[PDB]
Design a protein around this ligand. Structure first.
Ligand SMILES: *C/C=C1/C(=C/c2[nH]c(/C=C3[NH+]=C(/C=C4/NC(=O)C(C=C)=C4C)C(C)=C\3CCC(=O)O)c(CCC(=O)O)c2C)NC(=O)[C@H]1C
Ligand SMILES: *C/C=C1/C(=C/c2[nH]c(/C=C3[NH+]=C(/C=C4\NC(=O)C(C=C)=C4C)C(C)=C\3CCC(=O)O)c(CCC(=O)O)c2C)NC(=O)[C@H]1C
Ligand SMILES: [Cl-]
Ligand SMILES: [Cl-]
Lengths: 645, 646
């Protein structure tokens, strides 16, 4: 647009080489090699006449010698300087000199000066420093800075102007003695300080305009220089002001100004702006006191910001420990317990949902577009199909910010003014600074890096905890399946007692022990009597029901050492360790009587015939089963329901 | 001198009732406005305000308005806060006064106007140079050099206090007119609590001449309160003769020191020694203190940004652990990164124990000692908590070289340890002091600063988690692998590779239900080996079992694909034949019985089966069918073996 073109044209004016100065001093430019005064400001006579009573008009300077004009210390100091743009301050009783070396030149600015002897500045320094050290908060620091600067400088209005990333500004603190309207929280456009001017603070942190209506004095050529290109003046204070900005200050109701740049390392963070409603000069000592105060206040402010980051990281670690304590006691469960805390942690509105969120369907459309296209974070990109909501940080392996329309007050409505300057046609300054409002529909707060990494860390721990609940559940269920399939391999489905295999194993180990340690044990091998008659007359279901009954009757009779299992078909085995043949036969009698006398329960009466064997220094368990077996068979021959050895 | 060293810590240095002679002092009662004390040399300074003051006694005739400026009196009258000195100058005299309880204390010094920009230039240069420092080191060295350039003192040092109030000289700027003091430590006893506390009242202390004769306070008029007045808010307060002697033994004739405050905490001191007496005016004092104050705020900003970079480092390490896990073991990860963790935790060694495995890096005791430590922790009951010490020999007595230990307990289905090496490398003096400090840190490790501890619990948290995940994943792989084998054992038979008893009960039950839904027709064939006990006992188990395998091999080739064939009990088998009526069912039974008869003997006996057969006859339970097929099987067995019966 034509606006953009006009604002860009401001950069054409070379504000560092205006070949003129403000008239609150005088300036000489001297060629180092020839030691010849090559430039003098039109007002040089009225200052250097004090050094040289032969100086009457400007033209007399051409006839003068610099040793007649400069103090001894300034001359030696300029000769000694190898580094460029390092001003040297040297005073007489009536003049105050600031000189520096720039390429081939020495630039010397001189101001009239009165000697003034007191501890005022030292007391100011101690008090300002103590008051800034006492600030614990961004707010307290910036307001303390505004009051300190106003009291030191005496300016009618003092502001803290903070730059945003696009170089627009907001006034964040203010102190206004006389009747002025409050510019507090007013926004200013980037055009108001072009890049070329913001760049000045890096050469000299203070800029002084003691009189917006003072007539600039141009530099006149005295002797001819070997190079006629304009000399850079930006290191001093006397450099002339772009009439655009003189007019800007006029339109602002300001008659004199001073500003100091606020630097975070090499970055211009903002400025301290000082307006006065009548002309006002400030001496070199008040200037130094100002810049030192802003520099001490800035280090303090950055320290305050840095401590805020530490406090926030402590909160993040308290959150990650809280998450860890909850997961051990009880993953969406984890999300529900702490989300009110997390909303503070992440300065977000919505978080399975909590706080302000889209409905499940819109949330799934969100998810889906991310699946189509790490985390993702932005405030109202509008790069998708809208669902109210403007900020989203989504870690799929969701954090929501509602749009927050922000009314901004500007210091004047914009104007597309044109002005004809020397360097071309460019934007003229707005005529009104009256308050004027816009708002940003559809944007959210930007994501701070500290919040970003806290969020990536909370999501990382959550994913791990879901994985651990997972693996623990799968271990519980595979362990349960292994429990069932291991019971099925060892026991018999019907009767729920050791199958043949487990009885062979137990019997084998009882034999090995008894052979190793000379222990005594015996086995009981019994069978159900006339069982086929039960099966054919009553059926297998009734017969199997009898097998279950008989197992229940046998298991209640046995001692804790004995092991009881199903050997084959309707044959069962009992292993009685630490039992001699007498008590062994006794156990066979109690068992035999137990199966006879059990409850019939609408089923036939049942009898078992038991053979018995004793450990007789045997090698293998197979022999013992044979003895108990043929013994059982003699029990079958003498009439069933018997115990035989 | 020794008798004084016996009781130096108790000495009340704030109330010596004397001043150093680089000025004079008046003490005035606030209410009556009477001079009640004057320093013994008061005549020579106040003779300047009042040329009638000849001896000290003339002060008794004086009125405070005759000696003090109007600005000083009104400023004192308006002050409600105590101990905030007020600086007021005349053409010949320089006044500092403050209110303390009942009194106004006024210190006065002779004074000379400096008309020059020397101070503003010095200050700007100091600020620029400190602002250029990006590191702790650069800042402390720049500050020592600047303080020397401003104060003019032959030697300038920065003492940093440790948590126990010991001090270390960490920067120095010294003409070789003195010996180098860099890295010397002094014990906390060398600056008593009362002397460290004075910096909070006045940040600067000046001793222009160790050999100047102190001037006592004399009573001028009588005070309503007879107790000694506290003088600590000014600069003239007299110096403990013990410490004057300390500086004498050191070759120091004058000193200045400034406190370095982190908020209200005394972090260290800027000490300035000179080899001959040396005065410093009020403007140089203020310039010095302002410089230390700007430098201190800078240093705290540098430390705070270092904390930020350290937390970024910790987070980069915990992500690295997660990247490394993707190794087969937990001890594999520890071996790869423990040197980084030693940097991360500022410790000399680490040991990780997990079940039967032990890993060490750096300086550690041998494995056995590590087991004595573990056991002693789990014995004290202190195992479950975190535990840490910077003095093992006194905290954990009797475990003999190493001095620091941080032990993180880890619990699953079990430790991470950090080891730190001890610190090692009668006239008053810094040689006795440096060996006094050696005694205080004997067996004491560097204390565990808090930022490293939480780095350790957080690194350990991920270690326990990743070890647990490798564990649970391996154990789940093993439980899943075994269940396949135990599922082969539950559904199949050991010797025949054919369905178990269970699988035939289940198949039969489900076949009955299925036939019950669609009124479909199926039958079962129940066969047995004939005189098999006689075969087993005549030929043995090896031959007999191979016969069972032979018979299963022969039958499986007989079956149709729909039929299900399983081993029912002992030597009894079942065939479930879907889509088969009783005629075709009997046909299948004859083919099966004949199939088992003609098989290869292979030097083994001839074998025959007897088959019962049953058909689905509107049955409820699989029980009824087994009974029917069973009685049929028995009629075949009874009527001459090798038969099929319905
Ligand atoms: C038990 C009390 C003692 C004591 C008292 C005392 N000291 C000071 C001032 C000191 N003393 C310092 C001690 C040092 N330790 C060292 O290793 C070195 C060597 C470089 C020194 C100097 C010390 C550092 C200070 C302050 C700074 C300075 O160096 O000046 C005071 C305060 C004096 C006052 O002005 O009131 C007291 C009371 N001195 C001890 O040595 C022990 C015995
Ligand atoms: C096309 C060029 C434009 C232009 C030029 C311009 N502006 C400056 C200097 C300043 N502008 C400032 C702006 C503010 N002053 C305030 O008090 C506030 C309130 C918060 C703002 C936003 C400031 C502070 C300066 C510095 C000078 C000063 O301190 O007063 C210059 C450079 C001036 C110089 O030193 O030569 C130039 C060239 N401004 C535009 O509006 C357009 C027209
Ligand atoms: Cl200046
Ligand atoms: Cl002082």
């Amino acid at each position: 647009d034509d606006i953009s073109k006009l604002i860009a044209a401001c950069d054409q004016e070379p504000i560092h080489i205006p070949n003129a100065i403000q008239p609150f001093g005088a300036m000489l430019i001297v060629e180092k090699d020839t030691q010849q005064i090559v430039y003098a400001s039109a007002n040089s006579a009225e200052y250097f006449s004090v050094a040289d009573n032969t100086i009457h008009e400007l033209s007399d300077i051409k006839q003068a010698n610099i040793n007649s004009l400069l103090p001894e210390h300034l001359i030696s100091g300029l000769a000694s300087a190898i580094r460029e743009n390092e001003p040297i301050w040297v005073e007489t009783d009536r003049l105050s000199f600031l000189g520096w070396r720039h390429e081939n030149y020495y630039i010397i600015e001189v101001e009239r000066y009165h000697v003034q002897t007191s501890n005022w500045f030292e007391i100011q320094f101690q008090r300002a420093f103590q008051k800034l050290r006492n600030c614990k908060t961004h707010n307290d620091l910036i307001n303390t800075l505004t009051r300190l600067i106003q009291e030191i400088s005496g300016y009618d209005r003092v502001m803290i102007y903070q730059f945003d990333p696009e170089w627009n500004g907001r006034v964040i603190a203010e102190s206004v003695r006389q009747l002025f309207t409050s510019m507090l929280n007013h926004h200013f456009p980037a055009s108001d300080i072009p890049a070329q001017a913001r760049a000045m603070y890096s050469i000299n942190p203070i800029r002084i305009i003691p009189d917006v209506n003072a007539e600039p004095q141009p530099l006149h050529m005295i002797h001819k220089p070997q190079n006629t290109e304009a000399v850079n003046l930006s290191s001093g204070v006397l450099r002339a002001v772009s009439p655009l900005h003189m007019q800007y200050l006029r339109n602002f109701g300001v008659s004199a100004s001073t500003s100091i740049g606020i630097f975070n390392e090499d970055e211009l963070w903002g400025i301290v702006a000082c307006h006065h409603t009548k002309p006002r000069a400030i001496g070199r000592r008040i200037r130094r006191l100002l810049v030192r105060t802003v520099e001490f206040a800035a280090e303090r402010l950055w320290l305050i910001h840095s401590r805020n980051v530490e406090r926030y990281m402590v909160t993040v670690q308290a959150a990650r420990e809280q998450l860890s304590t909850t997961a051990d006691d009880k993953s969406h469960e984890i999300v529900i317990e702490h989300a009110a805390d997390w909303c503070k942690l992440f300065r977000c509105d919505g978080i399975t949902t909590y706080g302000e969120t889209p409905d499940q369907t819109t949330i799934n459309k969100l998810v889906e577009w991310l699946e189509e296209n790490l985390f993702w974070h932005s405030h109202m990109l509008k790069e998708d199909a809208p669902g109210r909501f403007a900020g989203l940080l989504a870690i799929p392996l969701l954090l929501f910010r509602v749009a927050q329309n922000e009314v901004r007050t500007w210091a004047g409505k914009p104007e597309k003014l044109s002005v004809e300057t020397s360097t071309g046609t460019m934007l003229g300054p707005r005529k009104s600074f009256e308050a004027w409002q816009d708002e940003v529909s559809g944007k959210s707060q930007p994501w701070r890096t500290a919040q970003l990494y806290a969020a990536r860390d909370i999501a990382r721990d959550l994913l791990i905890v879901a994985d651990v609940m997972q693996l623990n559940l799968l271990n519980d269920q595979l362990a349960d399946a292994n429990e069932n399939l291991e019971k099925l391999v060892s026991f018999d489905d019907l009767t729920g007692i050791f199958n043949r295999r487990r009885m062979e194993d137990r019997l084998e180990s009882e034999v090995k022990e008894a052979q190793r340690y000379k222990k005594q044990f015996g086995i009981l091998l019994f069978d159900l009597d006339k069982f086929k008659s039960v099966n054919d007359t009553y059926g297998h279901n009734i017969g199997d029901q009898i097998l279950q009954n008989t197992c229940a009757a046998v298991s209640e009779t046995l001692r804790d050492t004995d092991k009881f299992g199903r050997w084959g078909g309707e044959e069962f085995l009992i292993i009685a360790p630490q039992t001699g043949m007498p008590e062994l036969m006794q156990l066979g009698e109690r068992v035999r009587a137990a199966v006879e006398k059990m409850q019939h329960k609408d089923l036939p009466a049942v009898t078992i015939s038991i053979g018995v064997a004793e450990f007789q220094n045997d090698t293998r368990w197979d022999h013992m089963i044979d003895r108990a077996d043929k013994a059982m068979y003699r029990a079958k021959e003498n009439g069933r329901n018997q115990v035989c050895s």
